[PDB]
Structure 1
Amino acid sequence: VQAVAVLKGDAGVSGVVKFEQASESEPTTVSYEIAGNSPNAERGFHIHEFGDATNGCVSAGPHFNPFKKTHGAPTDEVRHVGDMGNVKTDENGVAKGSFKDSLIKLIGPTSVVGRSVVIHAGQDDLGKGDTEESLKTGNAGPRPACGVIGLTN
């Protein structure tokens, strides 16, 4: 199964995120190329619950969290399903990379097809700050771009 999200917004940030998963038990490979970010930075990257673009990136809602856990890093046990951590941008502000994840799925009751990917304007603190807010969003800040995850071939 393959899926893709095209990230768009009004702030100069844009990109493509591709997902591939062969079967339900297998990890999903996530690959991305995002440009227009601050150079040499770490930026929060997550799957949000809704694929609703009627009000910019706001209507994407909270981090996708079917299991009602707190925000964490992708390697934490306690993490939202949608937590993909920070992506690193190079000196031209481009973030490009790929990783495998075993909580994100394109198949089955937790499928992220039809939901949204959001790239943030700030660094995700990976649920390690103080605030209650660190345990909800990682204090990653505004959402300059986002896209609905759709099926492809």
Structure 2
Amino acid sequence: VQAVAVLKGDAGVSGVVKFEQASESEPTTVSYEIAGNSPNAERGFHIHEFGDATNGCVSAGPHFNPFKKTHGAPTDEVRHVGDMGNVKTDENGVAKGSFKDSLIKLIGPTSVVGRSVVIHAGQDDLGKGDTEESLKTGNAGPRPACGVIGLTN
């Protein structure tokens, strides 16, 4: 199964995020190409609960957290399903790469199809900051771009 999200916003940030999972027990491969970010930085990358674009990126809601855990790093045992950490931007402000993830799924009760992908304006503290907010959002900041995850061929 394949899915894709086109990140759009009004801050000059945009990109494409592709998802791919063969079966439900298999990990999902996430590939992304995002431009318009600050050069040479880390930017929070997450899947938010709602694929609602009526109110910009705001209506996407909180991080997809069906298991009611606190915010963390993709590699943490305790993290939100939608926690993809930080993406690295080069000197031209382009973030590009891919990775596999076992919590994010395109099949089953926790499918992210129809939900949102959000790129933040700030760095994700991975739930290590000493603030209550660290545990919810990772203090990643504003959401310059987002896209609803849709099915593709």
Shorter-chain TM-score category? Answer: over 0.9
Using the TM superposition, give the Cα deviation of residue 74 of structure 1 relative to its aligned residue in structure 2, in angstroms: 0.0
* Aligned equivalents of 2:7, 2:148: Cα separation in 1: 8
Per-residue CA deviation, residues 7-55 of structure 1 (Å, 9 max, x unaligned), is: 0000000000000000000000000000000000000000000000000
Using the TM superposition, give the Cα deviation of residue 127 of structure 1 relative to its aligned residue in structure 2, in angstroms: 0.1
Structure 2, unmatched stretches of 5+, are none
Using the TM superposition, give the Cα deviation of residue 6 of structure 1 relative to its aligned residue in structure 2, in angstroms: 0.1
- The alignment partner of 2:87 has SS state of strand
* Aligned equivalents of 1:115, 1:42: Cα separation in 2: 23
The TM-score with structure 1 as length reference comes to: 1.00
Using the TM superposition, give the Cα deviation of residue 131 of structure 1 relative to its aligned residue in structure 2, in angstroms: 0.6
Using the TM superposition, give the Cα deviation of residue 84 of structure 1 relative to its aligned residue in structure 2, in angstroms: 0.1
Using the TM superposition, give the Cα deviation of residue 94 of structure 1 relative to its aligned residue in structure 2, in angstroms: 0.1
* Aligned equivalents of 1:30, 1:24: Cα separation in 2: 15
- The alignment partner of 1:5 has SS state of strand
Per-residue CA deviation, residues 76-117 of structure 1 (Å, 9 max, x unaligned), is: 000000000000000000000000000000000000000000
Using the TM superposition, give the Cα deviation of residue 2 of structure 1 relative to its aligned residue in structure 2, in angstroms: 0.1
* Aligned equivalents of 2:67, 2:98: Cα separation in 1: 25
Deviating 4+ runs (over 6 angstroms)? none
Using the TM superposition, give the Cα deviation of residue 68 of structure 1 relative to its aligned residue in structure 2, in angstroms: 0.1
Using the TM superposition, give the Cα deviation of residue 63 of structure 1 relative to its aligned residue in structure 2, in angstroms: 0.0
Per-residue CA deviation, residues 105-146 of structure 1 (Å, 9 max, x unaligned), is: 000000000000000000000000001000000000000000
Indicate the percent of aligned positions where both proteins have the same amino acid: 100
The TM-score with structure 2 as length reference comes to: 1.00
- The alignment partner of 1:134 has SS state of helix
Provide the alpha-carbon RMSD of the alignment. 0.1
* Aligned equivalents of 2:47, 2:144: Cα separation in 1: 14
Structure 1, unmatched stretches of 5+, are none
* Aligned equivalents of 1:24, 1:40: Cα separation in 2: 35
Aligned residues: 153
